[PDB]
Design a protein around this ligand. Structure first.
Ligand SMILES: Cc1ccc(N/C=C2\C(=O)CCc3c2oc2c(Cl)c(Cl)c(O)cc32)cc1
Length: 329
């Protein structure tokens, strides 16, 4: 009969109550700036869909970041632009400051506020228990905001969380995979980085929602408090689900696919095995025990669940006792 449908348990119908133009990004008209306002300083990184540069606004000597988009699809470029404009001003959302036409690539170049980011490989080795809770709360503010605005990020990972640790500033970046949530819509499962893909993606269940980001966030939390980055270190997309199953167990995985009438890829028949769920104390050792608390493990347990409908929402996560000790603004 096919898979059972699913829908978000929060912010379900936010987009159908909005003007069509809010989410119909294919009809958006880009307002262009002057590309010669910015001088490229150095390349910061390259990805599948863009190259990113540190730059200077030569009109005021202000440092910015320029993201030159690769030619991809008028849809995906307009999608990222529309989402960045819809979310601009939200808590810990990276601010899109300008859009110009790059003369070399002949594609849009997005100009962002500059964040003096600490490399996450280096930064995660120094985070205290309080820092992890503090920055997790800051990420949750960004996630609840974009979810409340009908948008899922779909690429939550350490690389996409810029942190100025000297000034304790955090920004959620790279909205190139973000998408508007429409109930009943089937989405491409080829999103997120492998280590942060939710089980819904790994079992090819397309009717997912905001809760995908909360799984990715749980993967980040596990890597931080246990000091193992990434936590689920699969060699490919299939081994990725096996890695998750060796921790969460196979019985809850089969209950998950049974509930949604999902059929597993038969390739898993010879590699999945039979695994009990593990208690989190197995991953606690003398080198990370100062980052682990009963509150942290309860919170992690409520994020890392196979059933996307059972995971904490971002708002619910901010209510968790794990954050009782964090001073809020
Ligand atoms: C490989 C690859 C693909 C896509 C992306 N997209 C990056 C960014 C944005 O989408 C938001 C702005 C922003 C981006 O990267 C930044 C970095 Cl690295 C620093 Cl340091 C910063 O201050 C700001 C940003 C980056 C890298």
């Amino acid at each position: 009969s096919g898979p059972v449908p699913s829908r978000a348990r929060v912010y379900t119908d936010v987009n159908t109550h909005r003007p069509r133009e809010y989410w119909d990004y294919e009809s958006h008209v880009v307002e262009w700036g002057n590309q010669d306002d910015y001088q490229l300083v150095r390349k910061l990184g390259r990805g599948k869909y863009s190259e990113v540069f540190e730059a200077i606004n030569i009109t005021n000597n202000e440092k910015v970041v320029v993201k030159i988009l690769k030619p991809v699809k008028k849809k995906k470029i307009k999608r990222e632009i529309k989402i960045l404009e819809n979310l601009r001003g939200g808590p810990n959302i990276i601010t899109l400051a300008d859009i110009v036409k790059d003369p070399v690539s002949r594609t849009p170049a997005l100009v962002f506020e500059h964040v003096n980011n600490t490399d996450f490989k280096q930064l995660y080795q120094t985070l205290t228990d309080y820092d992890i809770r503090f920055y997790m709360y800051e990420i949750l503010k960004a996630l609840d905001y974009c979810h409340s605005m009908g948008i899922m990020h779909r690429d939550v990972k350490p690389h996409n969380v810029m942190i100025d640790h000297e000034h304790r500033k955090l920004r959620l970046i790279d909205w190139g995979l973000a998408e508007f949530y429409h109930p009943g819509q089937e989405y491409n499962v080829r999103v997120a980085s492998r280590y942060f893909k939710g089980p819904e993606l790994l079992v090819d269940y397309q009717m997912y929602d905001y809760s995908l980001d909360m799984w990715s966030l749980g993967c980040m939390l596990a890597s931080m408090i246990f000091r193992k980055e990434p936590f689920f270190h699969g060699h490919d997309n299939y081994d990725q689900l096996v890695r998750i199953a060796k921790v969460l167990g196979t019985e809850d995985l089969y209950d998950y696919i049974d509930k949604y009438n999902i059929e597993l890829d038969p390739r898993f028949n010879d590699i999945l095995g039979r695994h009990s769920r593990k208690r989190w104390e197995r991953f606690v050792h003398s080198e990370n025990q100062h980052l682990v608390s009963p509150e942290a493990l309860d919170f992690l347990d409520k994020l890392l669940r196979y059933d996307h409908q059972s995971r904490l929402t971002a708002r619910e996560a901010m209510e968790h006792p794990y954050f009782y000790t964090v001073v809020k603004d």
